[PDB]
């Protein structure tokens, strides 16, 4: 969370939270209504957002689903959708928290090791999350689209 | 070269070469004739070895050359053929040297970063070097087959 990140930085410098950190936390807690609403929106559009996200990903790179790809059959494509739902849940976590630390803690540490042990194309995973972000922005309010796009973009950068 | 490796070990220990290193270099210098024979055979049959291994790799993983893939296009399949040529010549260098130092230094260190930059499926490359292993073993003698297989096993494990 943003509060956790500020606390960690203050502890690292061995001091109390600065007025800038305090005002940032104050602004975040005051504006948290919009963040909770957007988390609710993404949770509601979870099923569709995953559906057309995976569809666009497969159309843009069918090799991952084609013969020889990681998720060739419907079974492994279902697993791929399961992972995409994981990452949607992580982005929801990031939106509610306000800071990317939950995302890093849950689904970005050792992710290269995971997707090199699984043989998954990490570039394909990045493209899938990018299509997720595009469809979410399409079905989300523009400014709120940017609010969620910050976390989607961070996950994209870490994946790439 | 195993001579260079033994020299490095001896200089690290600040001592002259031990009987183990002396016996190792003696065995290498006595087997240099067979090693050069294997190198000459690989150099002579390089193109057929690489082409057959690449086609076996294509059959294993058709998506590598499928549309939207890294090898898609005749340019991007000829570049796979070139990479396989590079790795076969590197294996020849390692066989003639007796140690894996040239292989690790020219094709193994930084290879994962290079293939991450280029988007290549290093697992697919490992399958390709495996197929080159079977093809070279078929084209090559049985007694030296184990010797060449050791270096192929090393490369497959490292680049896996």
């Amino acid at each position: 969370s943003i509060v956790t990140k500020s606390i960690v930085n203050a502890d690292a410098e061995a001091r109390y939270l600065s007025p800038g950190e305090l005002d940032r936390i104050k602004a975040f807690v005051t504006g948290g209504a919009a963040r909770l609403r957007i988390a609710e929106t993404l949770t509601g559009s979870r099923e569709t957002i995953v559906k057309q996200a995976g569809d666009r990903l497969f159309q843009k790179r069918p090799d991952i689903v084609s013969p020889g790809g990681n998720a060739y059959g419907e079974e492994m494509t279902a697993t791929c959708l399961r992972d995409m739902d994981y990452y949607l849940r992580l982005v929801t976590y990031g939106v509610v928290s306000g800071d990317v630390t939950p995302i890093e803690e849950i689904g970005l540490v050792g992710v290269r090791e995971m997707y090199r042990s699984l043989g998954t194309p990490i570039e394909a995973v990045a493209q899938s999350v990018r299509e997720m972000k595009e469809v979410a922005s399409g079905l989300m309010s523009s400014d709120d689209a940017a609010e969620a796009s910050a976390y989607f973009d961070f996950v994209i950068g870490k994946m790439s | 070269s195993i001579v260079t490796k033994s020299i490095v070990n001896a200089d690290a220990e600040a001592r002259y070469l031990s009987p183990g290193e002396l016996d190792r270099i003696k065995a290498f210098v006595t087997g240099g004739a067979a090693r050069l024979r294997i190198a000459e055979t690989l150099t002579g049959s390089r193109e057929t070895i690489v082409k057959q291994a690449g086609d076996r790799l294509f059959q294993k993983r058709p998506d590598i050359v499928s549309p939207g893939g890294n090898a898609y296009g005749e340019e991007m399949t000829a570049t796979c053929l070139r990479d396989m040529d590079y790795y076969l010549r590197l294996v020849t260098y390692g066989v003639v040297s007796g140690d894996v130092t040239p292989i690790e230094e020219i094709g193994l260190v930084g290879v994962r970063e290079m293939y991450r930059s280029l988007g290549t499926p290093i697992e697919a490359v490992a399958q390709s070097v495996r197929e080159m292993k079977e093809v070279a073993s078929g084209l090559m003698s049985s007694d030296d087959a184990a010797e060449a297989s050791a270096y192929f096993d090393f490369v497959i494990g490292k680049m896996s």
């Binding site: 013969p67 020889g68 060739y72 059959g73 079974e75 492994m76 | 059959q59 993983r61 058709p62």
Partner: peptide, 5 residues
């Protein structure tokens, strides 16, 4: 020609 699902 196939890949085990």
């Amino acid at each position: 020609w196939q890949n085990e699902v």
